[PDB]
Design a protein around this nucleic acid. Structure first.
Lengths: 134, 185, 260
RNA sequence: AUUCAUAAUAACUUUUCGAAUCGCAUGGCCUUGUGCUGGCGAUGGUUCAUUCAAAUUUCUGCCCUAUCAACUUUCGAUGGUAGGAUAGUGGCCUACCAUGGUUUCAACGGGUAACGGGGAAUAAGGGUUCGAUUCCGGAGAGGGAGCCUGAGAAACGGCUACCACAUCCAAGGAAGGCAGCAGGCGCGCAAAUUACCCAAUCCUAAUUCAGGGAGGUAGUGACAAUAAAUAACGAUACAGGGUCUUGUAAUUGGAAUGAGUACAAUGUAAAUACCUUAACGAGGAACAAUUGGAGGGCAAGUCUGGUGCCAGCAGCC
RNA sequence: UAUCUGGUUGAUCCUGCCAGUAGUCAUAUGCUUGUCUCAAAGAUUAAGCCAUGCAUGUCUAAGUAUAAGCAAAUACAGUGAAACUGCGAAUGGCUCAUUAAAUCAGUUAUCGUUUAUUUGAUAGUUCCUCUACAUGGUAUAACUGUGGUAAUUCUAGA
């Protein structure tokens, strides 16, 4: 393969969020696919963007290969890129960390078990220790 | 509690199922154009039935009715854009006089046979299914593509599909592989 | 059913929001405010489905709650604050001003305006009354009430509230020879001049309105909104100036558009 | 259109409301007191308007039944006055008084395998049949009644009592309500996972942040619906129509390609699958298509073979 | 868009009904099953009975903090369990048993009324012929520690 080409269309400036929104389309006549991080770096060197401050999220390849169309947006000043952005995408680009939590059933069971305790249960714990002691 | 996606059916079974003239004409069409079953003839008959019903209740409306003007102009412009009527037959009595062959002539397999490139309509269809035709730039593998009158000059082979070059297929690849492996050394 | 209603499903939203019937099974449900939800436009619909600024619901939540979008010169944070007709929604970080004026076809439009003229707003005075403690007060269609008006402001008429402290400036009468917007029913979004008003005691004084192109029609008086002298409206009219083209010449101008 | 809005007088009231609340800012004045004053907001607050609603309400419109022709008024049925009660109109109730009200233009009664509508099937029309079910409206949480709180409930993922079920036991007492999501038993001709998540659409809350079996995503899934793989071309030899065209053959040749396998990347909340694609993947018992039919309706046998009987010919064929 | 064909039928003609044909966003069931998009689904008999899990909770600069909680301005100041306070829990979602002028649809009415919330306006008058206004008083939870009950989201007393 010789090259892909990335064209940005319908560019909208959104100063309400300090960002620019656009529809990327890439012509990759040979390779297979997009290699999305290469597009992030390419859009970084297109405007001036420091590629950890960009995010392209929507992508789908046209029928019969070659053309892939998606939606992508650039934030200036990567602090706002961490600010006005959903957490799943920031984890997806490695600029955040996924928290681990128990699954929905365990959380619901724990909430509906400590709905049966009034107060801290320190009196209940002390009382049950004393009352099964003798 | 979410809306329905609407749906319908494009084919229509005939009223008298078993008529030797009808079976003969259906099979004649199937041989002359290379169809898979009788559903294609049924589907074109349903499309034609809708068009003729629209034409009938448009003509029962008076001349120079604005609804007649707008809907008839849209219908005639559409059916000349797809290229079933001719260029100089832009009147409703002609679109009453349409035949099923005038619609099957404008398909994809009929055009990719008539324009050369296939030498047989059955070979034309199987060459469509194997993803070998670009209309404009787009690979298509529906035989019933119903190509427009304008895009007739852009049917060719794809960037893939070794008739269009770009790295011949798997069988020839294995063939040259054993020529290099056994006959080569 | 035991109380009020808080949900509004898709297929039950106002049709002129142009909400896609798939991709979601609920509609914004404009919360209570100045306008009826059947004839309003929430902030989320305006900012999400018209200017394409936000993409989700939380996106416009984060746009609003940074204290950006002001309706009538006052900061709103609610996603479904019902911005209605003749409202003057403004955006600070882009230095842009807007005015909700109905499109010719019937739904809401996005009418850009200068920074001047965005500091006033017309309102159809709907009932004038001697209020508490003997003061007179008018109340208009947008829920505003104004105390001590001029005695010549009568019912079904138009006043001009600016934005600053109310304090109604020069106002309009209501008779023949006055430009008129229409905001309801089949003849919605159509601008013309009153030629005649027939008063039926018992209800629904129909109005005869003649447009720019001599297509007369009638509406009920509830939909009439007088906007000033013929040829001199005090606002900027939307694109096309409200003519209601028939579909045949709509086809004509639309293929006239095609080709360069 | 008013005894309307509003104003005034005389009073009256277990005298309602008229800020003892909170965050962020450090401005200004001089008699320099830690004196005076002052911003940007938050939360309340009486009344009126507005919005969200609510409740009553005018006209007109429903399926079958006359083997339903009289019905309602003892115990309100229709009307008057006055009171009570309600958010309020009103026989809504009470006291008193009138004798009315509906109907062959079908009252009243009975039946419904009846929730109503937008709508669905049915293409000459009008019609005939359906509408439990994605939207609008009503009713109900095993049956009834009653009720607290609250702006809003005669609420049942609130309470009390009774009835029918039924659980737990230390036998003294206690606790229930899937016609929410799964799922179980039963019933049937007849109907799916005790999965993942709030990423989307929205909703609630003091609230950008939490929560949501609402909803979405996957699993089962031939309810239904859309598009169309199971082969294509050549060469040889004959059969033809006839020097170019079709058919046949245990004749032959190389092409093409996805069903599948799968690096990868897109996709996604995370995944699966689709879109793209590295590499592999077709020579027939392969990667093999079935379901119905053949006297006429109604399309296609002047087929083949086998079994059983004959008081029929032959004689064991 | 508008075609019908067999049984009665012994030779004919009609009345006539039966059968055959086709559609179903109409249920079930049999055989077979490769692909892509799309996706209804315990309604019908039992509004029958339910094991277990989950389905309603909520915090900002802005009501209450001495958690003998976690960190890191001598009243407090950061974060932040429990509990008080405020709000919501009357929306959803499910089902179709009841219901025959009842519901419901279109169309009016409220000069016959209730409405938290949202939006807009709105309140120099208060005890007063001896007085906190540079600010009145009580409790009570949470908490500490003392206990019962087989058991309950039981709670007793300090």
């Amino acid at each position: 393969s010789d090259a892909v080409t990335i064209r940005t269309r319908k560019v909208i400036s959104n100063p309400l969020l300090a960002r620019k929104q656009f529809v990327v389309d890439v012509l990759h006549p040979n390779r297979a696919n997009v290699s999305k991080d290469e597009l992030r770096e390419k859009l970084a060197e297109v405007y001036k963007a420091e590629k950890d401050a960009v995010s392209v999220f929507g992508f789908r390849t046209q029928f019969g290969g070659g053309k892939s169309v998606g939606f992508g947006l650039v934030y200036n000043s990567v602090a706002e890129a961490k600010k006005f952005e959903p957490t799943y995408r920031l984890v997806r680009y490695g600029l955040a960390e996924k928290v681990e939590k128990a699954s929905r059933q365990q959380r619901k069971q724990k909430k509906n078990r400590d709905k049966k305790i009034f107060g801290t249960g320190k009196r209940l714990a002390k009382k049950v220790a004393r009352r099964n002691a003798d | 509690p979410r809306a329905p996606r609407t749906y319908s059916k494009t084919y229509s079974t005939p009223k008298r199922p078993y008529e030797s003239s009808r079976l003969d004409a259906e099979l004649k069409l199937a041989g002359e154009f290379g169809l898979k079953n009788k559903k294609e003839i049924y589907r074109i008959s349903f499309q034609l039935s809708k068009i003729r019903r629209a034409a009938r209740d448009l003509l029962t409306r008076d001349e120079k009715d604005p609804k007649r003007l707008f809907e008839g102009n849209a219908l005639i412009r559409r059916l000349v854009r797809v290229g079933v009527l001719s260029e100089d037959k832009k009147k409703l009595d002609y679109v009453l006089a349409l035949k099923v062959e005038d619609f099957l002539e404008r398909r994809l397999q009929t055009q990719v046979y008539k324009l050369g490139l296939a030498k047989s309509v059955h070979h034309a269809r199987v060459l469509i299914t194997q993803r070998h035709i670009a209309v404009g730039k787009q690979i298509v593998n529906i035989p019933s593509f119903m190509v427009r009158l304008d895009s007739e000059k852009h049917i060719d082979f794809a960037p893939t599909s070794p008739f269009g070059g770009a790295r011949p297929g798997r069988v020839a690849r294995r063939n040259a592989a054993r020529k290099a492996e056994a006959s080569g050394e | 059913a035991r109380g009020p209603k808080k949900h509004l499903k898709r297929l039950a939203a106002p049709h002129h929001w142009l909400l896609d019937k798939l991709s979601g099974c609920y509609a914004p449900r404009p919360s209570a405010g100045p306008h009826k939800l059947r004839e309003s436009l929430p902030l989320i619909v305006f900012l999400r489905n018209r200017l394409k600024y936000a993409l989700n619901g939380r996106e416009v939540k984060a746009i609003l709650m940074q204290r950006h979008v002001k309706v009538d010169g006052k900061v709103r944070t609610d996603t479904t604050y019902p911005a209605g007709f003749m409202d003057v929604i403004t955006l600070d970080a882009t230095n842009e001003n807007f005015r909700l004026v109905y499109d010719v076809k019937g739904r809401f439009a996005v009418h850009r305006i200068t920074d001047e003229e965005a500091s006033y707003k017309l309102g159809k005075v709907k009932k004038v009354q001697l209020g508490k403690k003997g003061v007179p007060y008018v109340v208009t269609h947008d829920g505003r009430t104004i105390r001590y008006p001029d005695p010549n402001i009568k019912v079904n008429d138009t006043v001009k509230i600016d934005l600053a402290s109310g304090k109604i400036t020069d106002f309009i009468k209501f008779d023949a020879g006055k430009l008129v917007y229409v905001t309801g029913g089949r003849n919605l979004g159509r601008i013309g001049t009153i030629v005649h008003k027939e008063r039926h005691d018992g209800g629904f004084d129909l109005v005869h309105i003649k447009d720019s192109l001599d297509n007369t029609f009638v509406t009920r008086l509830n939909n009439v909104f007088v906007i000033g002298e013929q040829g001199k409206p005090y606002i900027s009219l939307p694109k096309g100036k409200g003519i209601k083209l028939s579909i045949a010449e709509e086809r004509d101008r639309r293929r006239a558009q095609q080709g360069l």
